[PDB]
């Protein structure tokens, strides 16, 4: 259809590369944007909408902001057209969408992040752990999911405690689950690192929230950290831009046969496919989503902070089971 391949980013991605009885077939609209202000977003969106009723809308973001997703969701709700976040904050996962919204995101969700975490701890039989969390949003749901997944396995987990001098004193576990922000991660960890919970056998585990932007490791992050983040190394934009049309060309064709009518926007800024993408697969690759719009086979990866002070992949998640490249944990000294 009239797919608008929107790119809001400072990275050098050319538009000629994008250029390189059917009702719509395929049409490509290329636009490169640098500013990410509300005024610029709304102006560009309305300019595209007035331009011959473009159907598909795929967006990529180079910044690391959280309101880009909110603005995209608002625009999607007010224009009734699906939007896909591919990079940066656009590809970042938000908490709760709206039923009227048609914003479909990428990247794994927080709960799905815990499952791959607990699949690794079992693989190295660290059957005793502890939970340390802070008042940052998203701790309440992480607590509830942690307990539930433990009680329904054959391992028999031995969770110690969930967590200010007394709080740090009663810690005696070997593996510690941590959940806080980067500006607070270097603070809580520094307090414990001086107290004697770092060294040979004391393994900290953090989600993608605590360890976000790569190549920004602070001066105090004990080498040997384990975290899970989306794979951005080998899955380039080509595998992340062709996937946008793969979902839509199938959903539109499947919608046309069931309903002899193709959806469209309002063609004006002034005054369906909502539940048709649950079952979809292109060339074997299961691109189907969930009830909340999350991915079903997210491309997560496991990273470790070696001595050279850089994040490197240690394990890969595929299908439903991780395939670690070591299977026997080596030793990393920190500081």
């Amino acid at each position: 259809l009239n797919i608008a391949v929107l790119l809001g980013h400072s990275h050098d991605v050319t538009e000629r590369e994008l250029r390189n009885g059917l009702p719509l077939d395929v049409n490509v609209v290329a636009l490169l944007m640098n500013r990410t202000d509300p005024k610029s977003l709304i102006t560009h969106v309305c300019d595209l909408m007035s331009g011959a009723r473009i159907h598909g809308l795929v967006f990529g973001d180079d910044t690391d902001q959280e309101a880009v997703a909110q603005m995209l969701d608002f625009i999607s709700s007010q224009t009734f057209i699906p939007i896909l976040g591919i990079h940066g904050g656009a590809s970042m996962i938000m908490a709760d969408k709206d039923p009227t919204s048609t914003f479909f995101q990428f990247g794994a969700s927080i709960q799905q992040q815990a499952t791959v975490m607990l699949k690794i701890m079992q693989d190295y039989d660290w059957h005793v752990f502890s939970l340390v969390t802070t008042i940052f949003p998203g701790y309440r749901d992480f607590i509830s999911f942690i307990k539930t997944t433990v009680d329904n396995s054959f391992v028999g987990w031995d969770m110690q405690n969930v967590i200010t001098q007394v709080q740090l004193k009663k810690i005696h576990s070997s593996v510690i689950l941590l959940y806080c922000s980067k500006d607070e991660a270097v603070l809580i960890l520094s307090e414990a690192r001086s107290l004697g919970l770092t060294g040979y056998d004391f393994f900290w585990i953090v989600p993608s929230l605590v360890s976000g932007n790569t190549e920004l490791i602070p001066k105090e992050f004990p080498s040997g950290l384990i975290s899970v983040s989306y794979d951005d190394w080998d899955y380039s934009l080509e595998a992340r831009v062709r996937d946008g049309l793969g979902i839509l060309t199938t959903a539109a064709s499947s919608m046309l046969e069931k309903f002899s009518y193709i959806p469209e926007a309002k063609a004006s800024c002034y005054g369906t496919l909502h539940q048709f993408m649950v079952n979809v697969t292109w060339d074997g690759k299961d691109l189907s989503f969930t009830e909340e719009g999350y991915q079903v086979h997210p491309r997560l990866v496991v990273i470790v902070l070696n001595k050279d002070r850089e994040w490197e992949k240690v394990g890969k998640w595929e299908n439903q089971t991780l395939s670690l490249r070591h299977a026997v944990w080596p030793r990393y000294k920190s500081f």
């Binding site: 509300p38 005024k39 007010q78 800024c269």
Partner: peptide
């Protein structure tokens, strides 16, 4: 202002 696109853009500006 109705047409909340305007209600947001004008307020922002």
């Amino acid at each position: 202002k109705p047409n909340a696109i305007q209600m947001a853009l004008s307020v922002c500006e």
